[PDB]
């Protein structure tokens, strides 16, 4: 009769953290396949009835508007990532949920959530120090003009596309435009249909971002999950020399980094098992830049292929990913004021 | 349409009962075949991968399934080997025949088409029984590759029927590549290009786990195994196709 809650819903403990962990995976699943340039698209419809089709992790999360509060934290972290970088929202959301997935059975085995946070804060700092160590500055490599290297970057991003043959022509203009996009059945597009110009509108926008970020920051790292496997190697080898509960957690942190190259293979139709296993062997031998090749189903040096990304972007992704997992892992109870 | 008398209900009943026998035994194909847990009615159990042994303990009642059991026994008498490949071929052909019947083709036209494919099929293996042929799905790819060329030259319903006979042979190397720890599609694909450009030497080597020169890896079988397999399998598939209904007596 005299009840304490009186309709107030509330739960705490391990069932609350495990409940929030599963909700975080649901948000990653909505943007898991959008990872990469050749990623699958998502269709979203509003009350008006119009459909929005795009594989943009930033635009998708803004349209979902999930009511679960653990999901709101991940979506909010993406907005800070946009202001910080402008991209990397899919990697942060996908990688944050992977930390939660690997520490899920340890949480069930009675390991405290606070011990998990000490591993993420530790392994993240060790990873940031390794990024700045492996990161290389490229301004005058072999006395080559910067316009030449910047075209090789845009050509690789536009390779295996609708403008694959004429990628060199589009490569020059993209660099020259950086040094609006319009369609014709400012960058004017000429093609045999509207969808060839709509895909080319965003496909060239990716190359414009690549050329822009290379000019802003010359310190870069190998993309395609190449750095994620080196950090997975360094943190896994470092965890072995760490007596205590941080060993299994830092190792789990290392294994969680392998989801980025694993989805680039799955989203590209390749066999992620054969590539990720062959790729892990090349990293043990000394390959510090080998990664996933979206075009050829094989392992390739993304550094030599001019598939680069800034070092600060990868740092802010791990910081935002670890901060998001720690904030969810540090939560124990969800309180709801009835009103 | 009306379809007052529906004999198609018996065709899909024979095909499903025939395909179901092959869906089990197929995993036991090759040296690296997957074992099975056969539980007798008395609770006893035994682990084995022999294809002929699995069929004997199945205790099948359906007529079409019984013909596959008698089919497997015929290959043991004629050649003495390749027992699993026959039931797998007969099941895959009936699986491909299901698509043809949906297109509106009569079973008699399908039956006469496979006899023409079997004619060119024996000529292909004879060119590639005082003779031997490569193993590891080598002839099944050449048989699937060259029959598709003949289907382009023919006319009428034979092209769609002979093509299904060719695509059905790809289940054998697709099954061997699966048990050997490889991709069933990419492995079979790499062999067809190797066969168009090369010869029968291309195939699957389960000992090393990958494609390699079959003749150099000491994996060879006589010509009667693959020849008697297609002969007895086609005649069994043709018999199942010619059955419109089953009638009990007393």
């Amino acid at each position: 009769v005299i009840l304490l809650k009186e309709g107030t819903d509330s739960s705490q403990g391990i069932p609350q953290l495990v409940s929030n962990i599963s909700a975080c995976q649901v948000i990653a699943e909505a943007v898991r396949t959008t990872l990469g340039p050749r990623g699958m698209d998502k269709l979203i419809v509003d009350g008006r009835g119009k459909a929005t089709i795009s594989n943009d992790g930033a635009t998708i999360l803004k349209l979902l508007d999930v009511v679960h509060p653990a999901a709101k934290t991940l979506v909010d972290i993406a907005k800070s990532q946009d202001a910080e970088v402008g991209d990397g929202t899919t990697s942060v959301t996908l990688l944050a949920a992977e930390f939660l997935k690997q520490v899920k059975p340890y949480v069930e085995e009675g390991l405290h959530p606070q011990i998990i946070i000490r591993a993420f804060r530790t392994a993240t700092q060790l990873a940031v120090n390794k990024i700045k160590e492996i990161a290389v500055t490229v301004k005058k490599a072999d006395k080559v003009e910067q316009r030449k290297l910047l075209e090789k970057c845009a050509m690789t991003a536009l390779s295996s596309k609708l403008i694959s043959q004429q990628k060199a022509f589009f490569a020059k203009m993209v660099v020259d435009a950086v040094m609006g996009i319009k369609k014709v059945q400012t960058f004017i597009l000429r093609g045999g249909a509207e969808q060839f110009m709509e895909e080319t509108e965003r496909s060239l926008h990716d190359a414009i971002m690549i050329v822009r970020r290379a000019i802003k920051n010359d310190s870069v790292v190998a993309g395609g999950g190449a750095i994620e496997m080196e950090l997975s190697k360094y943190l896994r080898d470092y965890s072995r020399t760490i007596p205590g509960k941080q060993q299994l957690l830092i190792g789990a942190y290392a294994k969680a980094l392998e989801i980025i190259p694993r989805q680039l293979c799955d989203n590209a139709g390749f066999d992620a098992t054969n590539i990720l296993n062959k790729l892990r062997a090349r990293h043990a031998q000394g390959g510090t830049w080998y990664g996933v090749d979206i075009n050829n189903e094989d392992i390739a040096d993304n550094f030599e292929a001019f598939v680069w990304e800034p070092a600060m972007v990868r740092i802010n992704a791990l910081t935002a990913a670890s901060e998001a997992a720690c904030l969810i892992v540090s939560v124990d109870e969800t309180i709801k004021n009835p009103r | 349409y009306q379809d007052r008398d529906k004999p198609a209900q018996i065709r899909f009943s024979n095909i499903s009962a025939a395909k179901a026998v092959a869906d089990a035994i197929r995993t036991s194909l090759g040296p690296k075949g997957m074992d099975k847990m056969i539980q007798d009615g008395k609770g006893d159990v035994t682990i084995t991968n022999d294809g002929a042994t699995i069929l004997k303990q199945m205790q099948v009642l359906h007529p079409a399934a019984r013909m596959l059991v008698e089919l497997s026994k015929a290959q043991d008498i004629e050649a003495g080997d390749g027992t699993t490949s026959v039931v797998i071929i007969a099941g895959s052909l009936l699986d491909s025949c299901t698509k043809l019947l949906q297109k509106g083709i009569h079973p008699t036209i399908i039956s006469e088409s496979f006899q023409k494919a079997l004619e060119k099929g024996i000529e292909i293996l004879t060119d590639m029984k005082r003779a031997l042929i490569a193993g590891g799905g080598a002839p099944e790819i050449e048989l699937a590759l060259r029959l598709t060329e003949y289907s382009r030259t023919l006319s009428g319903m034979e092209s769609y029927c002979v093509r299904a006979f060719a695509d059905a042979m790809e289940v054998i190397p697709s099954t061997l590549a699966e048990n050997a720890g490889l991709n069933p599609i990419s492995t079979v694909t790499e062999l067809r290009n190797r066969h168009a450009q090369g010869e029968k030497t291309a195939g699957i080597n389960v000992r090393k786990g990958g494609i390699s020169n079959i003749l150099e890896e000491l994996v060879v079988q006589p010509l009667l195994v693959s020849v008697s397999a297609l002969t007895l399998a086609t005649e069994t598939v043709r018999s199942i196709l010619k059955i419109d209904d089953v009638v009990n007596t007393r």
């Binding site: 072995r240 509960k245 299994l248 043990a284 | 995993t27 690296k32 099975k36 539980q39 159990v45 720890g181």
Partner: protein
């Protein structure tokens, strides 16, 4: 289809044999080691038998399952051949099947998993070649096989890498039975063995085991805790042969 029995296949049948083998291990998991807890065995009559010997439990235990019966026959072969290590064999095999079932869910074929366990067992015997007990062998193999895995590739990394984690159940099980934090001791145990592989300097600790009385690492070379080499060697060969025997099954046919 018309048949006088039943038939079933898929991932559930491999999992059913995995969940069955895991139940036999848990029946003799807590009784591992000298401080193993006693366990009751209630016959159909009503009598009760109490003991802590893992070998005695498996001989008297009765579980109506084909996969579980393989582990019972497995313990008899290891018993008649050597007469020790039947408990660790059943526990190591169940963990390999647990991790193997997880790989099969990751689209890793069993033949790739089986080919890895045959390689991990082979190199493990080479690295082994009495021996320190207390989980010193299992902690060292967990590091060597994890590094050897990256050298091979070809879909054998996850199979050999999961073979490494499976061996840690022995120091993890003994640590729980000793009323200690197993995640700490197993981590402390792997740290000393990892430093042994980095460089051969004497500052790096080597050949460390577990102290079940005090609950801490201990150099079993000086403490006098050893076992016959054939036990640790054959226990991995029998455990690997049993996991392969259960993992090769992919169908169930009833009459």
């Amino acid at each position: 289809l018309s048949v006088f029995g039943d038939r079933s296949t898929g991932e559930t049948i491999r999992s059913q044999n995995v969940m069955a083998a895991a139940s036999i291990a848990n029946i003799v998991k807590s009784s591992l080691g000298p401080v193993g807890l006693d366990k009751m065995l209630v016959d159909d009559i009503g009598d009760v038998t109490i003991t802590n010997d893992g070998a005695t439990i498996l001989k008297l235990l009765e579980v109506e399952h084909p996969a579980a019966k393989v582990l019972c026959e497995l313990a008899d072969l290891q018993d008649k051949e050597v007469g020790d290590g039947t408990t660790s064999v059943v526990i190591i095999a169940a963990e390999l099947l647990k991790n193997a079932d997880e790989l099969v869910k990751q689209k890793i074929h069993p033949t790739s998993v089986i080919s890895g366990y045959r390689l991990a067992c082979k190199e493990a015997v080479r690295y082994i070649n009495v021996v320190p007990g207390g989980g010193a062998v299992e902690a060292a193999l967990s590091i060597y096989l994890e590094n050897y895995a990256t050298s091979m590739g070809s879909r054998e990394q996850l199979a050999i890498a999961e073979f490494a984690r499976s061996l840690l159940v022995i120091p993890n099980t003994l640590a729980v039975n000793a009323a200690q934090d197993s995640t700490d001791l197993v981590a402390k145990l792997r740290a000393f063995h990892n430093e042994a592989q980095v460089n051969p300097e004497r500052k790096n600790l080597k050949w460390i085991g577990l102290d079940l009385s005090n609950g801490k690492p201990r150099d079993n070379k000086q403490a006098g805790v050893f076992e016959p080499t054939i036990v640790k060697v054959k226990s991995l060969k029998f455990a690997t042969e049993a996991a392969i025997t259960i993992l090769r099954i992919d169908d169930l046919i009833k009459l």
